[PDB]
Scaffold this active site. Structure first.
Site, PDB file in Angstrom:
ATOM      1  N   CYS A   1       0.245  -1.328  -0.007  1.00 37.54           N
ATOM      2  CA  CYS A   1      -0.345   0.382   0.232  1.00 37.54           C
ATOM      3  C   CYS A   1       1.110   0.897   0.489  1.00 37.54           C
ATOM      4  CB  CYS A   1      -0.896   0.221   1.366  1.00 37.54           C
ATOM      5  SG  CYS A   1      -0.348  -0.059   2.822  1.00 37.54           S
ATOM      6  N   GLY A   2       2.067   1.226   0.023  1.00 39.26           N
ATOM      7  CA  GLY A   2       2.837   2.435   0.336  1.00 39.26           C
ATOM      8  C   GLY A   2       2.906   3.057   1.513  1.00 39.26           C
TER       9      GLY A   2
END
Lengths: 322, 122, 131, 120
Positions: free
Chosen positions: A89-90
């Site tokens: 997801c960063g």
């Protein structure tokens, strides 16, 4: 048996670097597919906004009274949050739910009786683990987001607003504006202007700087994205249309299409920004695994030479004592 | 490979060739994903010049001629740097990539390019 | 030999081919269009868009939208239009029974409109998948 | 470091400091390859408090006034115990880590955080 331990650790770091660069590249390919979906679904909404702008310029003096476009300021709020599907997801879902907390913070403080329509799997996991916030419906991404997810969300938001229960249905999502920075926006959805523009939570028509149709081009040797202003829009002409249906019913049947268009485009933009965040996270993970592979190979060669030195010095010491 | 030893001209052109090849090596994955069209213009000219340079680093050998057949060439350093200056600044960009491959002495690259274009005219 | 017809869902263009005779189930009922129709921009209910390819009569399954008739270049902006008949009626009636079932449990004020629209979409699904 | 020798408050604070530092050292490799973005809420709070702790453990010396400047601080025992009680208690979770680096007697960390957010 310590050298085989370091050898297997180095092998695991090599494999982890390989799979992280693979995830990076396939996430970039899915970013390309998301921009394909966006620029293919655009012209439907192009013709929709030109039709609706002409129709509302012919329908200002009238009485139109469509339940979607009415302004019932008795101030309930239905903030809808859409988050990422899978992980790594960063920093997508964290800052999304953080802005969600900030928005419900300003909301509950004003006593506006908010509620939440969670869309993403990570977001709805967060909400089922924290029941202190009220939530209406649950959605997911195993179902395809291009058609059925957007249709179900539009059905639920339409059933929430037309059955006039809550006002101010707004959607918190993440437009893909940069490959590293993805700042979320809060745009209202159903309390719309009859002219038919996307508005801010203030209402100040953020279609002025919506910056449609992002594309990906490298600048020097690294990947970047380009976002221009206007493309292939022909909204101007307003020919005679000869309305057979009653004009109030025409907009009454037109505005659900605009609901679906906006919901679908926001889903597609949040999906592309999630894939961009995952691409950046996997690039960083590949680079950190590369540097760790280098460090571990250095320590392994040191330990191998020390093992050989000790072994031969011990053999020679025994042979000299003998 | 230092300016004091090889001349500032030779050093700068060798560093520019290294930068070009390194940029192409970094950009191969993006060209595999996007393509040469969805790149930018400076990146596209970089990629084309890099393919030409990478094929210009080839050479037909006097001793490898015995099974390959090509007459084999000796290329001094002066013709090397004069050919790479021309292949790097935009003086020889309207040529096929298979024209610089397996030649020496950039005049032969232009001559084989003219022959490969005669193949098309014919 | 006919007007240009493009049925366009939000995400894609379904099919932009031209056919002869179209019955357009509006909010005012069914209306037939002709090649060289004078321009009428109407609405479209959750219903049935039947076409005619001048070789065979065919139905299209759509869940609502909006239509526009122009100078033989007509555009119909729909909600959920599945091309031709992609489904068979057994799973359609398996959806009809469950939609009428959940109409009872979904009895709150919003659930009225929601279940009613789900019913009008299941009914158009089955009456489109009859053929 | 036994509760009968250094009291129970000092012992409990040293135990909790070592526990959070040990949790940090544990998850260090996971946050080395992946990063801080993949931890849970309590694990990231543990990370932030461990970084605050390992910054507050440093100190300027009197004999190293030639290496840094900013002269050495003698930090008594009770002041150290109170500073780490404040870090671990949850009060000082809303101030920069660089306020803790190279200070003593956590009143000075509070003063340095005020100075940082004032000078901006």
């Amino acid at each position: 048996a310590n050298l085989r331990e370091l050898r297997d650790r180095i092998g695991s770091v090599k494999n982890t670097q390989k799979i992280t660069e693979a995830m990076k590249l396939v996430a970039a390919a899915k970013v390309r597919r998301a921009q394909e979906a966006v620029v293919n679904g655009r012209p439907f909404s192009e013709t929709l906004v030109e039709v609706l702008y002409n129709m509302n310029e012919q329908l200002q003096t009238e009485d139109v009274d469509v339940p979607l476009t009415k302004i019932r300021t008795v101030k309930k709020v239905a903030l809808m949050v859409v988050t990422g599907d899978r992980g790594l997801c960063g920093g997508f879902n964290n800052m999304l739910l953080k802005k969600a907390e900030s928005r419900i913070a300003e909301l509950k403080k004003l006593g506006v009786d908010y509620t939440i329509i969670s869309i993403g799997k990570k977001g709805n996991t967060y909400f089922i683990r924290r029941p202190e916030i009220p939530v209406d419906r649950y959605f997911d991404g195993t179902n395809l987001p291009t058609a059925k997810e957007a249709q179900a969300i539009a059905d639920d938001v339409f059933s929430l607003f037309v059955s006039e229960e809550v006002d101010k249905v707004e959607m918190l999502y993440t437009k893909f504006v940069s490959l590293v920075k993805s700042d979320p926006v809060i745009h209202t959805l159903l309390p719309l202007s009859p002219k038919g523009e996307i508005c801010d939570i203030n209402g100040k028509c953020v279609d002025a700087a919506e910056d449609e149709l992002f594309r990906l081009t490298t600048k020097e040797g690294k990947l970047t994205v380009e976002r221009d202003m206007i493309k292939t829009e022909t909204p101007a002409f307003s020919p005679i249309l000869e309305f057979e249906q009653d004009p109030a019913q025409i907009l009454d049947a037109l505005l659900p299409l605009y609901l679906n268009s906006q919901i679908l485009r926001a889903l597609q933009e949040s999906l592309a920004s999630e894939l961009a965040a995952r691409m950046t996270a996997m690039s960083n993970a590949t680079d950190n695994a590369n540097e760790l592979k280098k460090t571990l190979s250095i320590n392994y060669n040191r330990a191998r030479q020390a093992k050989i030195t000790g072994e031969i010095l011990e053999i020679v010491a025994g042979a000299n004592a003998c | 490979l230092q300016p004091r030893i090889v001349g500032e001209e030779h050093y700068e052109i060798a560093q520019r060739v290294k930068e070009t090849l390194q940029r192409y090596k970094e950009l191969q994955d993006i060209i595999a994903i996007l393509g040469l069209d969805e790149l930018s213009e400076e990146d596209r000219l970089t990629v084309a010049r890099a393919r030409k340079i990478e094929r210009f680093l080839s050479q037909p050998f006097f001793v490898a001629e015995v099974f390959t057949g090509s007459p084999g060439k000796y290329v001094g350093l002066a013709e090397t740097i004069r050919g790479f200056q021309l292949i790097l600044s935009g003086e020889l960009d309207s040529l096929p990539e298979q024209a610089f491959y397996l030649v020496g002495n950039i005049d032969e690259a232009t001559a084989k390019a003219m022959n490969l274009e005669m193949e098309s005219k014919l | 030999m006919t007007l240009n017809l493009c049925v366009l869902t939000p995400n894609r263009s379904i099919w932009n081919s031209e056919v002869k005779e179209i019955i357009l189930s509006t909010n005012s009922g069914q209306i037939g269009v002709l090649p060289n129709h004078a321009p009428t921009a109407t609405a479209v209910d959750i219903g049935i868009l039947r076409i005619r390819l001048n070789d065979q009569w065919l139905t299209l399954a759509l869940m609502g939208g909006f239509a526009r008739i122009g100078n033989n270049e007509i555009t119909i902006l729909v909600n959920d239009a599945e091309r031709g008949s992609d489904i068979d009626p057994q799973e359609a009636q398996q959806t009809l029974e469950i939609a009428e079932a959940n109409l009872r449990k979904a009895e709150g004020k919003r659930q009225k409109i929601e279940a009613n629209l789900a019913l009008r979409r299941a009914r158009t699904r089955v009456e489109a998948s009859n053929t």
